[PDB]
Design a binder for this molecule. Structure first.
Ligand SMILES: COc1c(NC(=O)c2ccc(C)c(-n3cc(C(=O)NCc4ccccc4)nn3)c2)cc(C(C)(C)C)cc1NS(C)(=O)=O
Length: 336
C-alpha cells in the first residue's frame, strides 16, 4: 500500500498516493472534483478525479460503480482510459472514497476552434476520430448521450479523445431525447456528431436554442417536418401531434446552411442529421464514407471486448454496490 498524504483543495480533503505530486484544481468545476497532478512514476501530467459522494445514496453508489466499470473496460485510442484508481481506505469497513486517474487532457474542441476556421482536412481528421472512438464505445453497447465540444479533447498532433464530466448539451442533443420518446438508440450520438461537425465547418452552433422547445423548432425547421414513415412509428397520439405542431416554422434547406463546404461533408451531414433515428447513419458506416477516404482503415478501427452490463438491471442496497466497487478497486491492474 502506497504512502498517502492529505491536503485541502478548495474545501475538500484530498488523500492521494505520494506518487502523485503538485495537485492543482482544474475545470472550475466543469469536470467535477478534478485536480491536475504530476505522476512521478512516469513524469506525465494526469487528471485525478475524486468521486463526489460515491455511496451517499443507491443512485450515487450505482453511478460510482458504473463509471469505475466503464473506465476499466475502455481501451481505445479515441476514448479516455483509466490509468489508476485508488482509495485511502485500508478496508471495506472504512472504504468511503474513490479516486480515478486518467491522462490529463490538453484542450477541448472549443479551445481549438475558438481560434480560426479549421481546414477541411482538419475537420475530416477530428470527426473521423470521434466516429472511430464512437464505433468502439457503441460496440460495447454503450451510449455517450452527451457528446459536445467540451467533452472532446485534442492534443498536439490533433489526436482526439472522448470523455464525460457527468456549450449547452442541448444544442447537440438528438430531438427524440428532448421529446422523451423513450427508446433511444446509439445514433442519438450520431446526431450530436453531426451538430459538432457542422459547427466546425461554419464556426457557428447549428441549433442554438434558448430552451428545448425553441431548440426543437429550430431542428424541425432544418431537417423538416416528420414524414409519413416516421409518424407511423410513434405510438403516442399526443406525441405525434406535438412533433407536428413544433414543425410550423418556415422550412430551411440544408445546402444553404453549409454553402462552400466540401460537398462530401454536406452529404455526410445529411446522413447524420436525419430526424428518423432508424435512418441515421451509424458510426461504423460513417467511417467508410468517402469524406474520410484519406483516413479510413478497416484494419485499424477496433471494437470493444464483450462488456458485462448485467449490473444495470440490478436493484441492490448501497453496501452491496459499495462492496462491488471495492472489489473493482482492488482488482485493478494498470496498463503497461
Ligand atoms: C463521468 O463518467 C464517465 C466517464 N468518465 C470520464 O470521462 C472521466 C473519468 C475520470 C477522469 C479523471 C476524467 N477527467 C479527465 C479530465 C481532464 O483531463 N480534464 C482536463 C481537460 C478536459 C477537457 C479538455 C481540456 C482539459 N477531467 N476529468 C474523466 C466516461 C464515459 C465515456 C466517455 C467512456 C462514455 C462515461 C461516463 N459516464 S458514467 C460511467 O455513466 O458516469
Amino acid at each position: 500500500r502506497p504512502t498517502f498524504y492529505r491536503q485541502e483543495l478548495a474545501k475538500t480533503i484530498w488523500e492521494v498516493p505520494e506518487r502523485y505530486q503538485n495537485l492543482s484544481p482544474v475545470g472550475s468545476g466543469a469536470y467535477g472534483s478534478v485536480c491536475a497532478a504530476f505522476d512521478t512514476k512516469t513524469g506525465h501530467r494526469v487528471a485525478v478525479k475524486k468521486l463526489s459522494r460515491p455511496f451517499q445514496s443507491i443512485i450515487h453508489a450505482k453511478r460510482t460503480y458504473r463509471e469505475l466499470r466503464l473506465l476499466k473496460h475502455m481501451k481505445h485510442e479515441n476514448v479516455i482510459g483509466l490509468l489508476d484508481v485508488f482509495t485511502p481506505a485500508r478496508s471495506l469497513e472504512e472504504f468511503n472514497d474513490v479516486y480515478l486517474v486518467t491522462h490529463l487532457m490538453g484542450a477541448d474542441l472549443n479551445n481549438i476552434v475558438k481560434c480560426a476556421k479549421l481546414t477541411d482536412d482538419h475537420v475530416q481528421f477530428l470527426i473521423y476520430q470521434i466516429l472511430r472512438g464512437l464505433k468502439y464505445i457503441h460496440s460495447a453497447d454503450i451510449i455517450h448521450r452527451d457528446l459536445k465540444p467540451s467533452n472532446l479533447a485534442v492534443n498536439e498532433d490533433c489526436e482526439l479523445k472522448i470523455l464525460d464530466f457527468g456549450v449547452a448539451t442541448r444544442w447537440y442533443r438528438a430531438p427524440e431525447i428532448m421529446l422523451n420518446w423513450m427508446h433511444y438508440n446509439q445514433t442519438v450520438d450520431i446526431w450530436s456528431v453531426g451538430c459538432i461537425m457542422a459547427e466546425l465547418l461554419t464556426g457557428r452552433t447549428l441549433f442554438p436554442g434558448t430552451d428545448h422547445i425553441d431548440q426543437l423548432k429550430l431542428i424541425l425547421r432544418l431537417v423538416g417536418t416528420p414524414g409519413a414513415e416516421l409518424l407511423k412509428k410513434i405510438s403516442s397520439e399526443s406525441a405525434r401531434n406535438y412533433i407536428q405542431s413544433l414543425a410550423q416554422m418556415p422550412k430551411m434547406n440544408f445546402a444553404n446552411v453549409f454553402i462552400g463546404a466540401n460537398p462530401l461533408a454536406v452529404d455526410l451531414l445529411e446522413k447524420m442529421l436525419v430526424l428518423d433515428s432508424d435512418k441515421r447513419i451509424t458510426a461504423a458506416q460513417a467511417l467508410a464514407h468517402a469524406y474520410f477516404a484519406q483516413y479510413h482503415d478497416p484494419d485499424d478501427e477496433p471494437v470493444a471486448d464483450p462488456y458485462d452490463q448485467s449490473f444495470e438491471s440490478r436493484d441492490l442496497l448501497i453496501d452491496e454496490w459499495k462492496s462491488l466497487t471495492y472489489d473493482e478497486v482492488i482488482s485493478f491492474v494498470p496498463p503497461p
